Amino acid sequence: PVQAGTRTFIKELRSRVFPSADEIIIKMHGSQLTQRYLEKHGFDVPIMVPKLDDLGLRLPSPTFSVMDVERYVGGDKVIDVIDVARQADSKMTLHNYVKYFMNPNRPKVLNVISLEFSDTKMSELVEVPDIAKKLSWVENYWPDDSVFPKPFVQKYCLMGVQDSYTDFHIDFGGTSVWYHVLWGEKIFYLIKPTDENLARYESWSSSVTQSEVFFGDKVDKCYKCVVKQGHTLFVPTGWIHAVLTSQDCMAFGGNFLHNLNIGMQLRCYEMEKRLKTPDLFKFPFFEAICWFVAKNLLETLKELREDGFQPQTYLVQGVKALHTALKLWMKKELVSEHAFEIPDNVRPGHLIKELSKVIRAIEEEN
Numbered sequence: 001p002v003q004a005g006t007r008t009f010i011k012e013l014r015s016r017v018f019p020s021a022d023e024i025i026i027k028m029h030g031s032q033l034t035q036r037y038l039e040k041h042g043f044d045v046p047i048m049v050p051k052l053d054d055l056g057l058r059l060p061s062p063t064f065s066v067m068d069v070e071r072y073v074g075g076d077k078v079i080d081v082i083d084v085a086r087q088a089d090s091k092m093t094l095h096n097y098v099k100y101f102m103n104p105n106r107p108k109v110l111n112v113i114s115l116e117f118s119d120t121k122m123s124e125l126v127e128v129p130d131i132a133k134k135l136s137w138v139e140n141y142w143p144d145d146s147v148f149p150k151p152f153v154q155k156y157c158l159m160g161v162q163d164s165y166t167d168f169h170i171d172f173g174g175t176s177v178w179y180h181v182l183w184g185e186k187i188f189y190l191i192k193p194t195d196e197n198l199a200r201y202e203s204w205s206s207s208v209t210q211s212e213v214f215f216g217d218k219v220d221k222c223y224k225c226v227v228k229q230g231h232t233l234f235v236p237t238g239w240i241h242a243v244l245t246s247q248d249c250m251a252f253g254g255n256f257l258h259n260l261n262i263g264m265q266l267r268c269y270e271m272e273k274r275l276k277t278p279d280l281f282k283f284p285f286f287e288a289i290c291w292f293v294a295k296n297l298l299e300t301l302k303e304l305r306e307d308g309f310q311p312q313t314y315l316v317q318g319v320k321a322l323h324t325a326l327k328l329w330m331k332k333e334l335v336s337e338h339a340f341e342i343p344d345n346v347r348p349g350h351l352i353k354e355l356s357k358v359i360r361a362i363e364e365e366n
């Protein structure tokens, strides 16, 4: 058995020659990446932006070190660290990790991918891509008067040593993500969320041998995408991926929900419940925001309707998806676990009704 994360597993991973990510990803300029563009062409595949020009992405120069991160963040903060060889979660202090990171003789391969710092002094040193902020649900529909706290999943600092490996997974809540390498290099293994691939992934996740079975071998194509320094990668909803730190690296990233692929976002969330993924603890109120969005998307439609216009395809599909989800969460035999997530500004029974007819119309009036 070849265990994920081990020196042996890495020998095989580094030797396989996967189909190039160039077969599917789109490379564009920071200026080309607009909400307008996405709403027409769709956001169904990874988008690569080689130069950060025009992304609105601001961050410390290529010399920003791991030592600086400890200063700006505070070596005291306890962080989640990954023992890659054992594919297990550990704990440490930003101080001890840096000490480990800088020692030339690393006795083990440890990785940091969950350090959220928007609540620290290192936050001012970073501004996320404008596109991410334009699409982000939290950026557009989160009321300043809710009881639920606003989620901080927009700024992560990643620091991994050579050969750190994150096994295949789908980002929490089915969120999209942006990724930038300050220095070093990351290698992404990307799998398209085809119905076949999603079923198989959920199967592989709920099987004991998951760690001895390379998921890349269970699908038709596993695209190798090399993210070199200065590059920014945008991974869309539901994409299954694994990442390998080919060399000591520091990168930044963030997660965001949007109106383009609501169907896939709802499918990935429901799957993550079925597998009881500890990751979902990062978007505790995914359902709360879904109600907020439904109210807004209902409005947009009510308008286009009362003025004789037909909505864009993705918007009907998306709203129709929210409809099923909201209705499922209200079932008498289930509402007891979803209830607390219903905002006090929304009338559950009523909203699901307004959605029902608005969808009824569009479907019939077409």
Ligand SMILES: O=C(O)CCC(=O)C(=O)O
Binding pocket: 111, 113, 158, 160, 164, 165, 166, 171, 177, 179, 186, 243, 244, 253
């Ligand atoms: O860097 C890693 O090892 C994993 C990163 C990742 O999965 C992400 O940004 O969505």
Ligand SMILES: [Fe+2]
Binding pocket: 169, 170, 171, 241
């Ligand atoms: Fe991920």
Ligand SMILES: [Fe+2]
Binding pocket: 135, 136, 137, 138, 139, 255, 256, 257, 258
């Ligand atoms: Fe968001």
